[PDB]
Structure 1
Amino acid sequence: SMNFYSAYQHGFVRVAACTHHTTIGDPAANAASVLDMARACHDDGAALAVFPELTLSGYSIEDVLLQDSLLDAVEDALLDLVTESADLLPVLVVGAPLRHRHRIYNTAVVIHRGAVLGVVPKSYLPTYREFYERRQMAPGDGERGTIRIGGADVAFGTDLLFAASDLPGFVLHVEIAEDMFVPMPPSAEAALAGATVLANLSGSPITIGRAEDRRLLARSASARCLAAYVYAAAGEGESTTDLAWDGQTMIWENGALLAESERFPKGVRRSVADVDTELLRSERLRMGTFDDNRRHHRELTESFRRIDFALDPPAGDIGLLREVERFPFVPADPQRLQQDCYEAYNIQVSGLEQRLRALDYPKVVIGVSGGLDSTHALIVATHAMDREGRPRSDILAFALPGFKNNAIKLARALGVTFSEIDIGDTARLMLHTIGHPYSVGEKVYDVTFENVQAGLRTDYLFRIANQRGGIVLGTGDLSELALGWSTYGVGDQMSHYNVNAGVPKTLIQHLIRWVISAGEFGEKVGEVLQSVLDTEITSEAKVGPFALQDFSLFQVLRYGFRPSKIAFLAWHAWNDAERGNWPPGFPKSERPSYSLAEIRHWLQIFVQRFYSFSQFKRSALPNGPKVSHGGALSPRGDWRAPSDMSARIWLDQIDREVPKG
């Protein structure tokens, strides 16, 4: 049914910030540069194209703004653009000095498919330092009503919203340069009122440090207002009588930079990006204090006039102009990954420090198997003990062989108290007592077989902890919590405190890597740790590759995206190993590509297990700290959900919407 490969059908909207070639005092020329750029935008299937402040006249022409011949030329040019726009897909937002009542206003003219939808005047006009705007032009704040343009009356003022009737995630608001720099910018009221994509036309003569100012204010705006912020500044061609221009364009989404263009270009430049309207939708649905703010400023926010237009965007495959990282929990950029690891580790450590202080420094009891999770937790434990001036011998590490050598090597190198307890006999006794086929020689490696052993490990650890005055450290990770890959209750799901509960599996390996690199525990410890990595990396058979499951988990836990949307995203991230970026630590022989067919398959498994099967294991969860901004799975925190629900609707959405391959 749905065209699976169409960005528009998954709730993206393609936006462009353009910097044209200014020809000061020559509107026909500026209009020509605009028309050519708008045609490119059309070709790219964009829905929106934002130009620089006072586009049609040039921002820097000062008193030439007041010349009748200039103002008349601007009108002529604007009407031709409007006429050409009948054949263009995107809504064009073009700057122009325009006559209304007594004066000329610094306006942005919102143009679409042959009509002017609205005209929006700058609200705050800088008249200080290099800025003289109040000399030529009038403030817009507080103007309402209509304005006459090519024999039509069209909405005029600071209170406008342009809403796409066939694309509700897309609601446009426009402001101009200085507007975003004052304590209470028009766009903040607009977002509370329903605007999701905020436009800014800017002239912005460039100086040292100013591009940082622009980024600080556009970025913070996108974040605080849970919105896209689309920004375009003037460039080559503006007068250099007292100023220079850099042509900067940028597109922001909720704090993140989607795109930006070359500063000081030779020639016109565009930023083109696919904004995820569902991402904005999801952020807002969850952050009730955003709506609370709206209600507080109800009078302000209900006064907006909503102007409708029908975008009717391209239905087909037009790619996805957006960076989709393979590991939502593991940034590919090394500066950022280093930071994330630093914070994850310190979260884990100090979380445990406080549990320890509160229990007047119990011993720490932990099962160590030489695998990734328990290795990392033993490290966390040791650091906590160190920072609290506790002897490392109060950490009681246990190997619990059933029916590798890294575990004792690590424990000996850290200098914790090591000990082995073979649970085989306890296991045989229990298997025979409940009458299981293995006790009678049959090779039935059941779920009860695997479970009796798993259970007996936790049983032992808990009893030792009662006996020796300790608490049992859990080692289960978030990806395990997500998928119900735990032995519930009497088993590895259960513990006194779980330092790993909020760390997804894809991040664990990078936390260990990080501890080695800090080099804090010395060379001997680093070598064992390194061996753990090398050994353990090279279950996954039943629940899928954790890379794919960690990807779906982030989408669901943070945004609640529907399955078809998660598949579209994962595919764009994973299907081609040569595209996008890998974090550090992925030798090229461990850089897999997944097909739609696979991504689909693992996702069916994921929704069934996450939404339905596994919640009961999460429901009775031991304490432990949240780590990732994506969320954690504590039924006391980020995820409150029924333990007895079917996942039918998610599975059915996959049947209907995701192609088989």
Structure 2
Amino acid sequence: SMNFYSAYQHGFVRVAACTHHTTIGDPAANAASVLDMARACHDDGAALAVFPELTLSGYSIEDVLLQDSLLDAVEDALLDLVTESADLLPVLVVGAPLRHRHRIYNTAVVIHRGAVLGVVPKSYLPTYREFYERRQMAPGDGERGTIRIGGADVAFGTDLLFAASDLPGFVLHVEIAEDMFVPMPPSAEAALAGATVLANLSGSPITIGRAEDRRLLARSASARCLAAYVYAAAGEGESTTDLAWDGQTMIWENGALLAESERFPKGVRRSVADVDTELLRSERLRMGTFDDNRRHHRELTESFRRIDFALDPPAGDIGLLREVERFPFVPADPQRLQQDCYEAYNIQVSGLEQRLRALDYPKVVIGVSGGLDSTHALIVATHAMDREGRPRSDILAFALPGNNAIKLARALGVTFSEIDIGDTARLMLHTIVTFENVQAGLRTDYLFRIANQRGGIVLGTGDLSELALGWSTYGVGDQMSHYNVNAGVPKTLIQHLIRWVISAGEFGEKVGEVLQSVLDTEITSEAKVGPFALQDFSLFQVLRYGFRPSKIAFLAWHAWNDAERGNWPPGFPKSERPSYSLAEIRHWLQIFVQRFYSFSQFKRSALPNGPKVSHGGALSPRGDWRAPSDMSARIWLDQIDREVPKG
């Protein structure tokens, strides 16, 4: 029933930061650039278009700001833009010097569908180094009430929110340039009062290092305020009597850069991106201290004035202007991925180290199959022992048949032994896929018994994705161990941790050759539960954000349906770059929500210790995931039936 391909119906809001062509001291010309860009934003289906500080006059005109003809021309141009907006989709946020009471104010005028919703004055006017703003303009901090524009009294002040009544996830707040650089910025109080999209109009003459400063402050605002931050600075056309300009625009969301434009461009530029209002909503739902901070500042935050507007956004397929990683646990960017792998590995190792110290260095018993998970756990166990100054021969590795394993153990210098469970199984199957659980259980039973006998503990090797799907023999089974270093690591990341270890090369070339052989042999269960690439994608969206299934399918389809779009991490030869149809994503998603929400929780409910690894979450019922073991997944399956097309 929803239009599945509509970004607006999935909770996105399309927003634009625009750098126009400045004609200093010519408001009709600045307005014609603005209108042209605003029409491009309309054609793109954008809900918001933010322009540079003092758009209609030029930022850089100093005492010209005070000339009656300049100020009159700004009013005439502004009113003409307002009439134009009757036919434009986006809210426009346009800068203007405007008269109010005794002075002119440096303002952002918020315009929508033929009306002015509000006028927001800059709160802090720098008057130091290259800035002289208090000479021409009055501070807006603490100003409230209304301003008279074109025959209407409209809201004026630095306490205004603009809330889309048909898009509750979109609540706009506006501030100007210096306002975001002070210790207590107006946007931070507005975020706590309910703003989700924070706009900044900037003039910002460019000097060496200044772009880094803008980025630092806008990025950290977006993170600390669990918000999108939409920034536009002035560019070509501002006076270069004493100053230069780079026209930078950028869009941040919760600390992530969604889009940015060319610095020092020839001609106008825009950043345009779909902000996920549900991502912002999900972060604020979970981070309770955000709301405790609002309650601490209740008087400050409860008094904002909320001005309502109806956006009436396009209902159809307008694409999705957003990078959606195929692997939420495996960043495509190589530098970022190296860092993640470094971090995961040390998490795993230091976790195990603390366990070994607290137990006065037991021997470590571990089942090794030659598979990715147990290969990597053995490497972790080895490094933990090395760092604790303990002999590698205190590692007791067991192959348990019902290849690369013995090679790897021999290359590491750990104690390797191979017990054949075939026979004990047989006497079991007699005294009482059955076949295949008896084996799994007898593996575990043995490992524990040897650990008892040898003064050791059992290290587990099962991974987070297996925990998510309940892929595991419950009880006496592979979940059970004294400490599982892989419990927090999703299957999709495991191969990269191994690659990272090989690249490290800190184990020497023989060990690297065996690990490489493991990767080559294992990479090329997924037949029952489907591709781990898709199941790890849904696990992240559910565990981090609680997104509904149709939202997850939509993100997954944009990431995965076309192998040529987007980016792939390192380690994917062209031939190993699969693409998935919506029918496939839908199928594996029905299996995901059933197994995750309903079937699998009981198996997780009694997990072994092991460290949390991913910022996306782990599944410890002592930690990130508290849930009932006895619930149906009916509503999630029904949501898929209702909202995700069959193909």
TM-score class normalised by the smaller sequence: over 0.9
Looking at structure 1, the residues matched to 165 and 303 of structure 2 have their Cα atoms a distance apart, in angstroms, of 20
Looking at structure 1, the residues matched to 328 and 475 of structure 2 have their Cα atoms a distance apart, in angstroms, of 30
Displacement of 1:92 in angstroms is 0.1
Displacement of 1:389 in angstroms is 0.1
Displacement of 1:538 in angstroms is 1.4
Looking at structure 2, the residues matched to 643 and 470 of structure 1 have their Cα atoms a distance apart, in angstroms, of 32
* Corresponding residue of 2:427: 429
Displacement of 1:94 in angstroms is 0.1
Looking at structure 2, the residues matched to 326 and 593 of structure 1 have their Cα atoms a distance apart, in angstroms, of 10
Looking at structure 2, the residues matched to 400 and 32 of structure 1 have their Cα atoms a distance apart, in angstroms, of 76
Secondary structure, aligned partner of 2:214: helix
Looking at structure 2, the residues matched to 374 and 487 of structure 1 have their Cα atoms a distance apart, in angstroms, of 16
Secondary structure, aligned partner of 1:543: coil
Displacement of 1:379 in angstroms is 0.2
Looking at structure 2, the residues matched to 155 and 528 of structure 1 have their Cα atoms a distance apart, in angstroms, of 70
Secondary structure, aligned partner of 1:110: strand
Residue deviations 1:540-565 (CA, integer Å, cap 9, x gap):
10000000000000000000000000
Residue deviations 1:58-93 (CA, integer Å, cap 9, x gap):
000000000000000000000000000000000000
Residue deviations 1:14-71 (CA, integer Å, cap 9, x gap):
0000000000000000000000000000000000000000000000000000000000
Residue deviations 1:299-332 (CA, integer Å, cap 9, x gap):
0000100000000000000000000000000000
Runs of 4+ aligned residues of structure 1 deviating over 3 Å after TM superposition are none
Looking at structure 1, the residues matched to 612 and 311 of structure 2 have their Cα atoms a distance apart, in angstroms, of 42
* TM-score between the two structures when normalised by the length of structure 2: 1.00
Looking at structure 2, the residues matched to 530 and 616 of structure 1 have their Cα atoms a distance apart, in angstroms, of 36
* Corresponding residue of 2:548: 562
Residue deviations 1:376-434 (CA, integer Å, cap 9, x gap):
000000000000000000000001111xx100000000000000111111000000111
Looking at structure 2, the residues matched to 307 and 632 of structure 1 have their Cα atoms a distance apart, in angstroms, of 41
Residue deviations 1:186-215 (CA, integer Å, cap 9, x gap):
000000000000000000000000000000
Residue deviations 1:567-589 (CA, integer Å, cap 9, x gap):
00000000000000000000111
Looking at structure 2, the residues matched to 513 and 49 of structure 1 have their Cα atoms a distance apart, in angstroms, of 44
Looking at structure 1, the residues matched to 567 and 16 of structure 2 have their Cα atoms a distance apart, in angstroms, of 24
Secondary structure, aligned partner of 1:323: coil
Looking at structure 2, the residues matched to 336 and 325 of structure 1 have their Cα atoms a distance apart, in angstroms, of 13
Looking at structure 1, the residues matched to 459 and 506 of structure 2 have their Cα atoms a distance apart, in angstroms, of 22
Secondary structure, aligned partner of 2:450: helix
* Corresponding residue of 2:443: 457
- In structure 2, which of residues 410, 416, 419 is the aligned counterpart of residue 418 of structure 1? 416
Displacement of 1:487 in angstroms is 1.0
Secondary structure, aligned partner of 1:366: strand
Displacement of 1:448 in angstroms is 1.3
Looking at structure 1, the residues matched to 604 and 312 of structure 2 have their Cα atoms a distance apart, in angstroms, of 44
- In structure 2, which of residues 465, 480, 489 is the aligned counterpart of residue 503 of structure 1? 489
Displacement of 1:143 in angstroms is 0.1
* Corresponding residue of 2:401: 401
Looking at structure 2, the residues matched to 616 and 511 of structure 1 have their Cα atoms a distance apart, in angstroms, of 29
* Corresponding residue of 1:263: 263
Looking at structure 2, the residues matched to 351 and 539 of structure 1 have their Cα atoms a distance apart, in angstroms, of 29
Displacement of 1:592 in angstroms is 0.5
* Corresponding residue of 2:250: 250
Looking at structure 2, the residues matched to 178 and 371 of structure 1 have their Cα atoms a distance apart, in angstroms, of 56
Residue deviations 1:261-310 (CA, integer Å, cap 9, x gap):
00000000000000000000000000000000000000000010000000
Looking at structure 2, the residues matched to 648 and 589 of structure 1 have their Cα atoms a distance apart, in angstroms, of 38
Residue deviations 1:587-641 (CA, integer Å, cap 9, x gap):
1111001000000000000000000000001000000000000000000000000
Secondary structure, aligned partner of 2:438: helix
Secondary structure, aligned partner of 2:204: coil
Displacement of 1:489 in angstroms is 1.1
Displacement of 1:347 in angstroms is 0.2
* Corresponding residue of 2:391: 391
Displacement of 1:469 in angstroms is 0.4
Looking at structure 1, the residues matched to 93 and 452 of structure 2 have their Cα atoms a distance apart, in angstroms, of 70
Residue deviations 1:464-496 (CA, integer Å, cap 9, x gap):
000000000000000000000011110101000
Displacement of 1:514 in angstroms is 0.3
Looking at structure 2, the residues matched to 600 and 485 of structure 1 have their Cα atoms a distance apart, in angstroms, of 20
Secondary structure, aligned partner of 1:541: coil
Residue deviations 1:205-231 (CA, integer Å, cap 9, x gap):
000000000000000000000000000
Displacement of 1:534 in angstroms is 0.2
* Corresponding residue of 2:159: 159
Secondary structure, aligned partner of 2:158: coil
Secondary structure, aligned partner of 2:365: strand
Looking at structure 2, the residues matched to 340 and 635 of structure 1 have their Cα atoms a distance apart, in angstroms, of 24
Looking at structure 2, the residues matched to 618 and 244 of structure 1 have their Cα atoms a distance apart, in angstroms, of 60
Displacement of 1:7 in angstroms is 0.1
Looking at structure 2, the residues matched to 599 and 533 of structure 1 have their Cα atoms a distance apart, in angstroms, of 26
Looking at structure 2, the residues matched to 84 and 582 of structure 1 have their Cα atoms a distance apart, in angstroms, of 44
Looking at structure 1, the residues matched to 464 and 453 of structure 2 have their Cα atoms a distance apart, in angstroms, of 30
Secondary structure, aligned partner of 1:123: coil
Secondary structure, aligned partner of 1:327: coil
Q: RMSD across aligned C-alpha pairs, in angstroms?
A: 0.3
Looking at structure 1, the residues matched to 205 and 211 of structure 2 have their Cα atoms a distance apart, in angstroms, of 10
Secondary structure, aligned partner of 1:540: coil
Secondary structure, aligned partner of 2:437: helix
Secondary structure, aligned partner of 2:86: helix
Secondary structure, aligned partner of 1:95: strand
* Corresponding residue of 1:439: none
Displacement of 1:367 in angstroms is 0.3
Secondary structure, aligned partner of 2:172: strand
Secondary structure, aligned partner of 1:229: strand
Is 2:126 the partner of 1:126?
yes
* Corresponding residue of 2:631: 645
Is 2:621 the partner of 1:623?
no
Secondary structure, aligned partner of 2:279: helix
Looking at structure 1, the residues matched to 479 and 209 of structure 2 have their Cα atoms a distance apart, in angstroms, of 52
Looking at structure 2, the residues matched to 399 and 496 of structure 1 have their Cα atoms a distance apart, in angstroms, of 19
Looking at structure 1, the residues matched to 370 and 60 of structure 2 have their Cα atoms a distance apart, in angstroms, of 68
Residue deviations 1:152-186 (CA, integer Å, cap 9, x gap):
00000000000000000000000000000000000
Q: Which runs of 5+ in 2 are unaligned?
A: none
Secondary structure, aligned partner of 1:341: helix
Secondary structure, aligned partner of 1:74: helix
Secondary structure, aligned partner of 2:527: helix
Secondary structure, aligned partner of 1:508: helix
Displacement of 1:510 in angstroms is 0.1
Looking at structure 2, the residues matched to 538 and 197 of structure 1 have their Cα atoms a distance apart, in angstroms, of 45
Secondary structure, aligned partner of 2:247: coil
Looking at structure 2, the residues matched to 578 and 79 of structure 1 have their Cα atoms a distance apart, in angstroms, of 47
- Count residues in correspondence: 647
Looking at structure 2, the residues matched to 230 and 538 of structure 1 have their Cα atoms a distance apart, in angstroms, of 44
Secondary structure, aligned partner of 1:535: helix
